Amino acid sequence: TLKPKEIKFNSWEELLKWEPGAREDDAINRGSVVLASRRTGHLVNEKASKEAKVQALSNTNSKAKDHASVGGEEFKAYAFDYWQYLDSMVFWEGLVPTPDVIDAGHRNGVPVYGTLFFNWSNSIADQERFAEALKQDADGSFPIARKLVDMAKYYGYDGYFINQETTGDLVKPLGEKMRQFMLYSKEYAAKVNHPIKYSWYDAMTYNYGRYHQDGLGEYNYQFMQPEGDKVPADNFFANFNWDKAKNDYTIATANWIGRNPYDVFAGLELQQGGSYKTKVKWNDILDENGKLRLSLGLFAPDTITSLGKTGEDYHKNEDIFFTGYQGDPTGQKPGDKDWYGIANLVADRTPAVGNTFTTSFNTGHGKKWFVDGKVSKDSEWNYRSVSGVLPTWRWWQTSTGEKLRAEYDFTDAYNGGNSLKFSGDVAGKTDQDVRLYSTKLEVTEKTKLRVAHKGGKGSKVYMAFSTTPDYKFDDADAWKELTLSDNWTNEEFDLSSLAGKTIYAVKLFFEHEGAVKDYQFNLGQLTISDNHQEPQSPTSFSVVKQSLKNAQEAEAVVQFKGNKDADFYEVYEKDGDSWKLLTGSSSTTIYLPKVSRSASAQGTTQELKVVAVGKNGVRSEAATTTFDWGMTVKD
Secondary structure (H helix, E strand, O other): OOOOOOOOOOOHHHHHOOOOOOOOOHHHHOOOOOOOOOEOOOOOOOOOEOOOOEEEEEOOOOOOOOOEOOEEOOOOOOOOOOHHHOOEEEEOOOOOOOHHHHHHHHHOOOOEEEEEEEEEEOOHHHHHHHHHHOOOOOOOOOHHHHHHHHHHHHHOOOEEEEEEEEOOOOOHHHHHHHHHHHHHHHHHHHHOOOOOEEEEEOOEOOOOOEOOOOOOOOOOHHHOOOEOOEOOOOEEEEOOOOOHHHHHHHHHHHHHHOOOHHHEEEEEEHHHHOHHHOOOOHHHHEOOOOOEOOEEEEEOHHHHHHHOOOHHHHHHHHHHHHOOOOOOOOOOOOOOOOOOOHHHHEOOOEOOEEOEEEEOOOOOEEOOEEEOOEEEEOOOEEOHHHOOOOOOOOOEEEEOOOOOEEEEEOOOOOOEOOEEEEEEEEOOOEEEEEEEEEEEEEOOOOOEEEEEEEEOOOOEEEEEEEOOOOOOOOOHHHEEEOOOEEEEEEEEEEOHHHOOOEEEEEEEEEEEOOOEEEEEEEEEEEEEEOOOOOOOOOEEEEEEEEEEEEOOEEEEEEEEEOOOOEEEEEEEEEEOOEEEEEEEEOOOEEEEEEEEOOOOOOOOEEEEEEEEEEOOOOEOOOEEEEEEOOOOOOO
């Protein structure tokens, strides 16, 4: 069995037998990307809050039998890219998040939590399963808590959401132990140098079994009550039937016990409600100035995949959800709509901090995979481990006249599955901009800008940077004109004149001198870095496992040693005279679901290669190895 699979335990005894490295797919199932730091930039929406937070409880993965834990050879996926508004992502489907989700979230600076679910039930079997989790050693420690911590450390994720929906006579007395299990976990996680957080559903009361308060209150406060410096639950997820009075009570209760009210996330039932069509009592959670007074808990926002038919529709629907119907995170809810875009209410954050930032707008899925503007993988995929950093703002536009339409372009890309396209009929002379990223990038004498782009016929296009935190673009040394052409080009600009300054934002600016029917410009890659070097090639590359289906089709697992400059890796096969990309991963162990040869292939072996794609956007030289079929196609 070469295909890596989600991690599920059939009993607590099985979990107590878990050990690092003891599963054949562990090398692939581990997260590979450390949790990135983020900045919170200047507020761009007058109604947004830097205190209010958003937690997503998402069914992130395919439900197909025998789907892989890394993704698959299909475009449609929960290719989440709105990290900039999230506090955390909860992997709802199981205890141990898959590496595709962990890597994507971590690159974007968002912690990823597994889910510990105790069934909605009063069966003795379920009451016992709950009691069994809370078994203690003589010293009061909880062995199951240790295993949960140990797995978070090994697989590289950040904690758990506990949904304790089991009730009955054997459950009622266990509130104190449940609380101590969470506190103890914090002690042990510190001991092993891998802190974790817990998020707790408003379900099990301290003394009375299951009862939702739709808030924090007199029956559940103990789960949030501090022990000085430590807390049991870090976040609290209030049940869906909150209202003004319940929210008032929650705030009073949090304040009294010495917790931040914004650590309570008011739940939105998006599965039954239909994503942004969900009716929400906004008036009961917004204060007199139209600002959130509690955080937001998104239950099952992945339902949004059901609202359209295509992968392209998924992103467009997410824009309505996260940005809002008005289409610009700086704007207000339209008067004819009830839904508030998340951006209308919650400040953005950014992982684009330091001396280096790169993106090719990789959303973790595609219909094809492009390499420097050429099709390399000519077929569909989702491998979210390689998800990159998409624009902060979708879309912050100003114009002297009409505004171009901005969208992802899955038909043409520079690297990965999509670029950004800006298009429309331009009616006459116009100047306009699209503000794309919030950043905090330090410029030195060695800093350069690399920009891949295509099209723009009938315009001049510039990239401009703000060197102040309030996003003014008044610095003459921070405007660069692009040299347009009809093909993909990748141009480099010296930013040394900005040495000692900090870049806080990135925008495009377009000038049209007259009308242009069906104007189009694509942005394919953006890199600001003081490192122009190729990363070193991977080493010690080999095929470590393989399973032939026939002489033209096989599964494989490859492994190599990488280096700290690599953001992720791409694996290719040589198919006749051409290299063709198979997959990409942040990991140094990679599953290949289909190594393939044509009917006319010669010989008994076939070359494979792996390339490191740098954090500075530059590819390494390839490392190569030889896959041995052990037969010709005609034998």
